[PDB]
Design a protein around this ligand. Structure first.
Ligand code: CLA
Ligand code: CLA
Ligand code: CLA
Ligand code: CLA
Ligand code: CLA
Ligand code: A1EB4
Ligand code: A1EB1
Ligand code: A86
Ligand code: A86
Ligand code: KC2
Ligand code: KC2
Lengths: 197, 228, 218, 228
């Protein structure tokens, strides 16, 4: 059913649905689409914060694999999406093998079941203290965190638009008018896993 | 409802002329939404075109005469002679894109339903007043003033005064559209406007293709600014 | 207790101001506690900052005036800018100052005689009496930290609360004054009417022992 | 309440013109605080501007004539005749900043809540009498005299005489504002004021910039002057 969340102002207080999509399937298809939207949003917001850290030259005061010789300093010297191509070859393995573990746990170990059948989409709270290693929300009421989830969805959509704009500007020059030309944002415009494959 | 209101507005605007619809545009469903939505969309389009044309005529006079602004320091420093059309051909592409984005934001705020239900109005093609715009709705950033009446100097007007103002706005917008189109035609094809012969120069570019070959990068920022 | 916070402030500057906090540090919870504990903690923090600031302001006036301990190790350093006198102190002297202050506040945290802590209902900025519990300190010392010669001792409670309000106001003014003097040592032109005084100084005032990091890039 | 009072005050100030409000300032909402507070803010601004303008006319006459009070203080650094516009360009920066701080302290004391509620009155916007600066009752230090009536020579005034004095003060403040603006315009743009042509000299510095090129940092101090 298209009651859900994400429907509010600046869209007519109704579902934004030119193409069917929402009615392409049933209730479980909507839950999968909402989980994809929320995960996509969260990944885009994280990518935006990381990209802002990369542009402002905020790197760790460490070494990042002294055997290879790569350091944190010359990972910030190059532009975005080229730094990932220089993260040795074991580091991509470790970042990856960490992330499927989280994906497999976030789908499997639900006491209520997958988000399509029992349990709201975008809720890996069964992974204890994964979302909140400190408290942060610990005394917030339910009516507060519903509005916070709505803000989460809106900021996720905006971050998706922003990271698409950043990728387009790094790939095709002149795509984004406000970006136009920039000292940074100079690179391949995309990152393959493990550099070349 | 819509046809009778259109006929009454046409009679009020010009008692001699009345309704002048040679193409029959008041009876064609443009998007299959009956005749009320089509008539409301046509009325809103006429009002918006007239308002934009009056603003364009005033800006044409101001720019062709040449004028600075408050502080300026950049907008009135680049060109000396502009000949109207080339005034929007030497400003930065970022400035023109931001002006277009602000116009689009204003249009989206005008057409929004959440900004209309809060203000107690409806859409122009769903049984509402064509040309009405929301004041500030609720955008967190508190607007210092509204858009329709910036100083709130027209909050005591009677409904007859509002109707007379709407009719006068439509007629003056039509006249300003004729004047602006005549000036644009004289800027391209000489001899079109007989009164405006020689007043305006000739431009090789097209004013109907928006973002032309763009202006400079125009960094225009200082005090520790690394880009525009 | 966001109500007694207003009763304290009706006597602060009349009702000319009252409960004035633009970012509202009151009605907070902090480290997994209740609003009353946070209010008591904030009151104790304000009182301790005020006391440290009045002591520091008096010390700055005395040191920059030229009054100096003759004795032996303080005669070695010959400067004026109080901050530089701290910088050219021996490391052991600074460490012993820090550890003595730490012992004093370790005793201040200990409540073996007065029943409440300043977060659990005690008076904020109350240093417990040394000789109240003479069998629960490592070795006997007289001359208690607050009121060494028992000059106040028996006094009216109205005089006590009036002195507490006076201490709070004087503390806030001394906080402003000593930060004005420190910013004079760091930022010239800042804090007018004090430009003709104080010396230029570098070395990140809010850091003891070594130097050379600073807020050079503002 | 506000509109009837405004009309009555306009009729009392001038029975011929009456309520003359061209640019709709009676019903303009500033920050969504209704019309009574808007009218109170407008009346307070008008009264303060008129009083400051009368004081400005008196000060301009005194500075143009030249009546330096004595020595030691800032009068020893002012030149012996440099007209009113250059009088506020050679005073010490400390003196000008201290005068601005004293004016700000006076304004804050006038607009304070408890400093006005101690006199049994409210704020001017929140249903109060505009322009009523309260007496000193809670200034911590013992104040020697009040600010409105220093000699307390108007303690026997009646309400009708108070209203007549308020009307006379408003009218004289408007006239003095016109005169001071005429003198300022003649000091910059020649030929503006016809009667004030050739009387006052021309000033090149901006009269709208209070922190223009800074005055001397000399203190003119003695007896223990350890502050440089
Ligand atoms: C889409 C997410 C994403 C991706 C793919 C990257 C990718 C990268 N980051 Mg990065 N980063 C991110 C988000 C991301 N970041 C966010 C959200 C922050 C803010 C906390 C940072 C802060 C950050 C710093 C401070 C540094 C990197 C660095 C790097 C590079 C080396 C890998 C590394 O040490 O990872 C480290 C990645 C993290 C610690 C992010 C973990 C975020 C999760 C959500 C836990 C919190 C690599 C290109 C290093 C570098 O050389 O870049 C110039 C470096 O020093 N990142
Ligand atoms: C983009 C411009 C635009 C648009 C959308 C419309 C739209 C409309 N005009 Mg219109 N009009 C315009 C420019 C425009 N006008 C100009 C520039 C003139 C002056 C020559 C007129 C003079 C005009 C007359 C005299 C009449 C209309 C009428 C109408 C309506 C039915 C056709 C419709 C709402 C008719 C109307 O309102 O009655 C239905 C009508 O009688 N128009
Ligand atoms: C359709 C409306 C419209 C558009 C597109 C522009 C477009 C522009 N104006 Mg403009 N202007 C307009 C209406 C408009 N004006 C009106 C109604 C006024 C009167 C208030 C002005 C007064 C004005 C000034 C005073 C200035 C511009 C300037 C500019 C340019 C930046 C740009 C070409 C600037 C420029 O480059 O001109 C020299 C400038 O200084 N405009
Ligand atoms: C915030 C409190 C504070 C702090 C951190 C300092 C810190 C310092 N003071 Mg100092 N001082 C203070 C308050 C303070 N003072 C007060 C209130 C007075 C007035 C009684 C003085 C009078 C004073 C003198 C006369 C001298 C110092 C000196 C010094 C320096 C050497 C340490 C020493 O022998 O101190 C000794 C300080 C005390 C015994 C005062 C104890 C603090 C009171 C009781 C609280 C050091 C930078 C010496 C210096 O820099 O010259 C080389 C020095 O000769 N101080
Ligand atoms: C309206 C407010 C105002 C302001 C901003 C100033 C500003 C100034 N006055 Mg001033 N003055 C004013 C009203 C004002 N006056 C009034 C009403 C009087 C009459 C009592 C005077 C009498 C006066 C004297 C007698 C002197 C100044 C002087 C000065 C200057 C120091 C400075 C430019 C001094 C100066 O530099 O003049 C040469 C000076 O000696 N003023
Ligand atoms: C140790 C750390 C401890 C703290 C952890 C922590 O930080 O918490 C992280 C956290 C949290 C939290 C809380 O739990 C806390 C801590 C406490 C609790 O009580 C409250 C909450 C909140 C639950 C939130 C995170 C929010 C994020 C990441 C938001 C990120 C959001 C990115 C966006 C919007 C991107 C936007 C991109 C844009 C604008 C790009 C762009 C554009 C266009 C859009 C394309 C348009 C235009 O283009 C043109 C026209 O040309 C201009 C351009 C180029 O600019
Ligand atoms: C790697 C396999 C890890 C096993 C799995 C594991 O334990 O998971 C933990 C995990 C991620 C994760 C997850 C959590 C979020 C934590 C929990 C989730 O929980 C659920 C249910 O969701 C699951 C998961 C997987 O998502 C990651 C662990 C990663 C680990 C343990 C990584 C060791 C690197 C050591 C290196 C690179 C040594 C380099 C050594 C190098 C490169 C040398 O050159 C050595 C050298 O000698 C050479 C060759 C020659 C000599 O002359 C010189 C020297 C001496 C220098
Ligand atoms: C160049 C110049 O100036 O010429 C000067 C030089 C000079 C020398 C200054 C001059 C002199 C003569 C002077 C000044 C003579 C002064 C002699 C003096 C004043 C000698 C004090 C002894 C103190 C004692 C024994 C303290 C014991 C103290 C003890 C044992 C305690 O504290 C115990 C304690 O139990 C208390 C009491 C309180 C308890 O709660 C706690 C504790 C446990 C801590 C002249 C003649 O004027 C000329
Ligand atoms: C019960 C009873 O009877 O009471 C008795 C017992 C009791 C209570 C134990 C007593 C005590 C204890 C003591 C020792 C009390 C004293 C406490 C102390 C030592 C209090 C210092 C304050 C320092 C201040 C305020 C510094 C301000 C400094 C200020 C405000 C500034 O610098 C402002 C300024 O910088 C700006 C902001 C900008 C510049 O352009 C201008 C200036 C430079 C001006 C008494 C006194 O014996 C009385
Ligand atoms: C994504 C999350 C992540 C996790 C959970 C995680 C866990 C652990 C643990 C378990 C507690 C250990 C003990 C460990 C140790 C090492 N890590 Mg991990 N590591 C992660 C990320 C990266 C990245 C991005 C890189 C990296 C590396 C190394 C090297 C360097 C080897 C050498 O000395 O050269 C060593 C010793 C670098 C590498 O790949 O070396 C080529 C490098 O680029 N690691 N790492
Ligand atoms: C740098 C040190 C310092 C300075 C500069 C300073 C200045 C002033 C001033 C002048 C501005 C006044 C007027 C004043 C007044 C009072 N002080 Mg302060 N005081 C300092 C230190 C301490 C300590 C350590 C304690 C203390 C206290 C009290 C009490 C309460 C007595 C009572 O309630 O019996 C009163 C009335 C005790 C306490 O607050 O107990 C609840 C306590 O432990 N004070 N104090």
């Amino acid at each position: 059913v298209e009651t859900m969340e994400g429907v509010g102002p600046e869209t007519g207080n109704k579902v934004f649905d030119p193409v069917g999509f929402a009615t392409l399937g049933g209730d479980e298809t909507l839950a999968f689409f909402r989980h994809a939207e929320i995960k996509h949003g969260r990944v885009a917001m994280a990518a935006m914060v990381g990209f802002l850290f990369h542009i402002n030259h905020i790197h760790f005061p460490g070494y990042l694999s002294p055997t290879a010789g790569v350091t944190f300093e010359q990972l910030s010297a190059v532009g975005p999406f080229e730094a990932w191509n220089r993260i040795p070859l074991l580091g991509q393995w470790k970042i990856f093998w960490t992330i499927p573990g989280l994906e497999h746990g976030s789908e499997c170990l639900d006491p209520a079941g997958p988000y399509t059948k029992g349990g709201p989409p975008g809720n890996p709270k069964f992974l204890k203290n994964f979302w909140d290693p400190p408290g942060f929300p610990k005394k917030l009421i339910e009516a507060q965190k519903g509005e916070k989830l709505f803000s989460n969805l809106k900021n996720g959509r905006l971050a998706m638009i922003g990271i698409a704009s950043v990728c387009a500007a790094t790939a095709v020059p002149g795509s984004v008018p406000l970006l136009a030309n920039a000292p940074a944002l100079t690179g391949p415009g995309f990152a393959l896993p493990f550099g070349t494959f | 409802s819509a046809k009778a209101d259109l006929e009454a507005f046409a009679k009020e605007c010009n008692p001699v002329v009345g309704y002048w619809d040679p193409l029959g545009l008041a009876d064609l469903p443009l998007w299959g939404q009956d005749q009320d939505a089509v008539i409301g969309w046509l009325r809103h389009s006429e009002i918006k075109h007239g308002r934009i044309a009056m603003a364009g005529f005033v800006g044409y006079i101001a720019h062709a005469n040449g004028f600075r602004f408050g502080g300026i320091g950049p907008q009135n420093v680049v060109p000396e002679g502009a000949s109207a059309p080339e005034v929007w051909d030497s400003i930065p592409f970022l400035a023109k894109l931001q002006i277009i984005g602000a116009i689009g934001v204003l249009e989206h705020i005008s057409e929004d339903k959440n900004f209309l239900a809060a203000d107690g109005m409806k859409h122009y093609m769903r049984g509402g007043k064509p040309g009405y715009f929301p004041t500030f709705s609720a955008n967190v950033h508190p607007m210092p003033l509204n858009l329709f009446d910036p100083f709130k100097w027209s909050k005591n007007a009677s409904p007859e005064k509002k109707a007379k103002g709407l009719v006068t706005e439509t007629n003056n917008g039509r006249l300003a559209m004729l004047g602006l189109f005549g000036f644009l035609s004289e800027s391209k094809i000489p001899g079109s406007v007989p009164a405006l012969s020689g007043i305006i120069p000739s431009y090789d570019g097209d004013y109907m293709q928006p973002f032309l070959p763009t202006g400079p990068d125009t960094s225009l920022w200082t005090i520790g600014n690394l880009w525009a | 207790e966001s109500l007694s916070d207003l009763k304290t402030l009706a006597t602060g500057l009349n009702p000319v101001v009252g409960y004035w906090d633009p970012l509202k540090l009151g009605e907070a919870e902090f480290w997994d506690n209740t609003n009353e504990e946070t209010i008591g903690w904030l009151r104790h923090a304000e009182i301790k900052h005020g006391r440290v600031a009045m002591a520091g302001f008096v010390g700055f006036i005395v040191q920059a005036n030229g009054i100096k301990f003759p004795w032996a190790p303080f005669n070695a350093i010959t400067s004026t800018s109080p901050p530089e006198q701290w910088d050219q102190l021996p490391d052991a002297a600074k460490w012993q100052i820090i550890l003595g202050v730490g012992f004093l506040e370790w005793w201040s945290e200990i409540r073996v005689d007065g029943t409440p802590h300043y977060m659990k209902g005690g008076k904020p900025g109350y240093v417990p009496d040394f000789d109240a519990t003479p069998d629960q300190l490592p070795h006997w010392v007289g001359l208690n930290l607050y009121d060494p010669l028992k000059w106040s001792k028996g006094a009216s409670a109205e005089k006590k609360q009036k002195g507490l309000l006076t201490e709070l106001n004087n503390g806030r003014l001394a906080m402003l004054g000593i930060m004005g003097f420190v910013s004079e040592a760091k930022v010239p032109g800042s804090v007018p009417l004090l430009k003709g005084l104080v010396a230029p100084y570098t070395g990140e005032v809010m850091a003891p022992f070594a130097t050379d990091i600073d807020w050079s890039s503002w």
